[PDB]
Amino acid sequence: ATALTNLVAEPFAKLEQDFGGSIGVYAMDTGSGATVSYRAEERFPLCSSFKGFLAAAVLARSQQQAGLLDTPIRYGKNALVPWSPISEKYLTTGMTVAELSAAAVQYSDNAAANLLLKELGGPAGLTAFMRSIGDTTFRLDRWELELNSAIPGDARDTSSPRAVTESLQKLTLGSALAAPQRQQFVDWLKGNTTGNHRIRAAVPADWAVGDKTGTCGVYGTANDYAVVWPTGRAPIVLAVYTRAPNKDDKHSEAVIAAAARLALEGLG
Numbered sequence: 001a002t003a004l005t006n007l008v009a010e011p012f013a014k015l016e017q018d019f020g021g022s023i024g025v026y027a028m029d030t031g032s033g034a035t036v037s038y039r040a041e042e043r044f045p046l047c048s049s050f051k052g053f054l055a056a057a058v059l060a061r062s063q064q065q066a067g068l069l070d071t072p073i074r075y076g077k078n079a080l081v082p083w084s085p086i087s088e089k090y091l092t093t094g095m096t097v098a099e100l101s102a103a104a105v106q107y108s109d110n111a112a113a114n115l116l117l118k119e120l121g122g123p124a125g126l127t128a129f130m131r132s133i134g135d136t137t138f139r140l141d142r143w144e145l146e147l148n149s150a151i152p153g154d155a156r157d158t159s160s161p162r163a164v165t166e167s168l169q170k171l172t173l174g175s176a177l178a179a180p181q182r183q184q185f186v187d188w189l190k191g192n193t194t195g196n197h198r199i200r201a202a203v204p205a206d207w208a209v210g211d212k213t214g215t216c217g218v219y220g221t222a223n224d225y226a227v228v229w230p231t232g233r234a235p236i237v238l239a240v241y242t243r244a245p246n247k248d249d250k251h252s253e254a255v256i257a258a259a260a261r262l263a264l265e266g267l268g
């Protein structure tokens with residue numbers, strides 16, 4: 001007999017009640033193949049969370065462009081937008097593609113992400129990379145900061161929890177990338193600094209976690225995805241996305257962590 005998904009679902013719905021919006025969750029145990037799925041195929045805005053996949057797409061390009069990663073990008077003030085703490089620091093020198101990638105992933109640097117998007121042929125270039133690995137859901141249409149608008153009903157700049165998790169698995173654990181590039185992606189995710197109150201908060205401290213967050217700043221819209229390695233066990237991949245109907249509904253990191261805990265504990 002199969003899982004009673006109504007029972008697996010119940011506590012996510014209770015969390016939604018107090019939150020005042022929608023929570024989307026997909027979690028996959030790579031050992032057993034067990035999953036937890038709550039609104040997993042609904043669309044949610046990516047916000048900054050596209051930056052993980054951006055870095056993967058950059059790594060993919062580097063496979064065909066030797067020394068791309070150590071190439072300096074030297075930019076002018078037009079590259080700069082708010083929430084770009086690392087790229088702002090290096091305006092007077094420039095940053096290598098690798099540095100930009102790490103900044104986009106680990107500090108969620110906006111300008112760094114726009115610079116790398118330009119390298120890939122814009123939002124459509126990143127979407128094309130995601131199509132190349134079989135992700136038909138992911139869509140990045142706009143740049144920083146407009147991609148964060150998170151307007152209800154807008155499908156631009158969204159994906160699903162399930163597609164995010166599936167794509168993350170392919171890129172971090174599967175062989176979609178060459179092994180050095182795969183390990184570089186994993187290391188960048190592992191060194192994220194912005195995720196300590198989201199999925200990481202649900203995970204025992206001594207288990208390795210790599211994640212990427214997003215916070216649109218409106219419509220209760222915020223998220224995190226991660227790969228989790230429990231010691232001596234097969235890794236877990238999961239995604240937790242929120243949105244809410246009013247512009248002024250607050251996002252909640254606590255809700256994200258609680259949804260992550262519920263997902264992780266429901267596996268098997």
Ligand SMILES: [Cl-]
Nearest residue numbers: 076077078079
């Ligand atoms: Cl400029």
